[PDB]
Amino acid sequence: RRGSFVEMVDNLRGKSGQGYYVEMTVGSPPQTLNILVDTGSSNFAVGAAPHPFLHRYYQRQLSSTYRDLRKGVYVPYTQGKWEGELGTDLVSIPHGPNVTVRANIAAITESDKFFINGSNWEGILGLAYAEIARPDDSLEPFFDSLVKQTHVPNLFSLQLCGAGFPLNQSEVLASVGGSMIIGGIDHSLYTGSLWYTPIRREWYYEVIIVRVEINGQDLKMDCKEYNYDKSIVDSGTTNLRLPKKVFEAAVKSIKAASSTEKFPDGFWLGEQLVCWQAGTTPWNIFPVISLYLMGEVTNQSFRITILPQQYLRPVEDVATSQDDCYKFAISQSSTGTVMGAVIMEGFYVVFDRARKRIGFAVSACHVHDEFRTAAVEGPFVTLDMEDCGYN
Amino acid sequence: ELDXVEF
Structure with a gap:
């Protein structure tokens, strides 16, 4: 508060x-x-x-x-x-x-x-x-x-704030992009509770994903696949990056959920923008994505859920027109999962080095609509979570 | 567009 x-x-x-x-x-x-x-x-x-x-x-x-x-x-x-x-x-x-x-x-x-x-x-x-x-x-x-x-204190927290629309260089310079609280946690930056996942090993800020859902539907993959290689949180990576196999299945599922509208492969490959008439982006046809992370208590997990307002990255139109345009900010990886900027914009992230854990809470500055919001919810009973870690 | 280290 x-x-x-x-x-x-x-x-x-x-x-x-x-x-x-x-x-x-x-x-x-x-x-x-x-x-x-x-x-x-x-x-x-x-x-x-x-x-x-x-x-x-x-x-x-x-x-x-x-x-x-x-x-x-x-x-x-x-x-x-x-x-x-x-x-x-x-x-x-x-x-x-x-x-x-x-x-x-x-x-x-x-x-x-x-x-x-x-x-x-x-x-x-x-x-x-x-x-x-x-x-x-x-x-x-x-x-x-x-x-x-x-x-x-041996801890820092980050609130990255995406605008939800494009910003020219004058705007980026004049606008507040967020907060990096060195040595602490500022309660004005989030709503709800903070849920913590363990930092697997202190090198990258590594975590373990134990389940993935696309609009509530289990992607249903062997959880090791979700961390195939590793899973890290990286403010310096723009996109949510997924191991090739996971990416292919996730895109298949996201495509099926939003099938009321067809988009070119260049869009799903994160190469080309898609545009809609001013203010008509059909947010509701795109699914929310939920990533389940290992909890601090045995057999316990929690999930973080983002909206397309997070995974669809605002970009100015090719013709600088009045359309609302975006690029698909989820892409494949051959080096594990990377929870980048677009995922972090949905949450206040606490890098608690002292307690070797990372905390997530709904960001007070995440972009959403009047029908849905990002979320951090738990606890869920999950068994054999460490099994999800790749060796 | 950013993809920040290799190990």
């Missing part, structure tokens, strides 16, 4: 397709930079040289507190990659706790398909664990430094 973390509430900007970022400063004197919040990696890095898609960048020669680790680093992601130089420097977060810490920083010197034209961010904050950090787990991630060096 209350919350109580006002200095951090509304400190994010951006959208699902270009990422959500937070303002940070690095160096002495402070150099202001926009940093993408990414729970799918563990390296804090920043553009350290001119780039066509960068308005500004980190200038080590201008920071009196900069320290050179004399070591290069290479970081590849599902899509995009970069190369940089390791060092450390003082870091702060204007709309975050009032502390300054010395953290590791990769000064990006070369990159490919990493930076995005007009996203307005110039660096990335890898919020996951050391295990996946490059070059290796000896490079302490930013959040580990923060906790070790201050009294900020």
Whole structure:
């Protein structure tokens, strides 16, 4: 009901397709930079040289507190990659706790398909664990430094707010995109209860999905398939990504449920937009999707349910017309499930590192209609859940 | 359009 973390509430900007970022400063004197919040990696890095898609960048020669680790680093992601130089420097977060810490920083010197034209961010904050950090787990991630060096609780929470309609660059810059509450939980960001799922292993923020429903109908697959490889929560991935086999069955089911309207394969492949006359998007013909996650109590699970208002990503019309257009934001994966931005926009997500668990609650800013809402409900009796984890 | 690390 209350919350109580006002200095951090509304400190994010951006959208699902270009990422959500937070303002940070690095160096002495402070150099202001926009940093993408990414729970799918563990390296804090920043553009350290001119780039066509960068308005500004980190200038080590201008920071009196900069320290050179004399070591290069290479970081590849599902899509995009970069190369940089390791060092450390003082870091702060204007709309975050009032502390300054010395953290590791990769000064990006070369990159490919990493930076995005007009996203307005110039660096990335890898919020996951050391295990996946490059070059290796000896490079302490930013959040580990923060906790070790201050009294900020070992926990952060994220409320990513999708608009439900497209935003030009002027709008994205002028609008609040959400909240990243460092060291706490703000009750003003959600409704209902918070349900927690265990973090399987501390590397990516890994979880276990035990069941999947499309409009209440069991996708009915061997639950290991749902985590075939792994299942992670990643704010830096736009789409809800599913293992190929799961994806194929899910799309078959979503197609059957929305069959009152036919759409081209390019749409289901997430390649082309679909448009409807202003205000007539037929939300009701699309099904809700429910992901069941392992609970903290034995044989207990809970589910999170999203609407098409979450999985249909708003995009401006090819002709910038007055139609309401979207792309299908669910796609296949050969590297496990990725609960990306479009899924996170439906919920307030608590990354409780201290208790090795992740919490979900209906977001106070999720998009919906007058007939349906996102939901987080439980408990459900589920047996042999760990069996769902892939080894 | 974002797909942020490989292990």
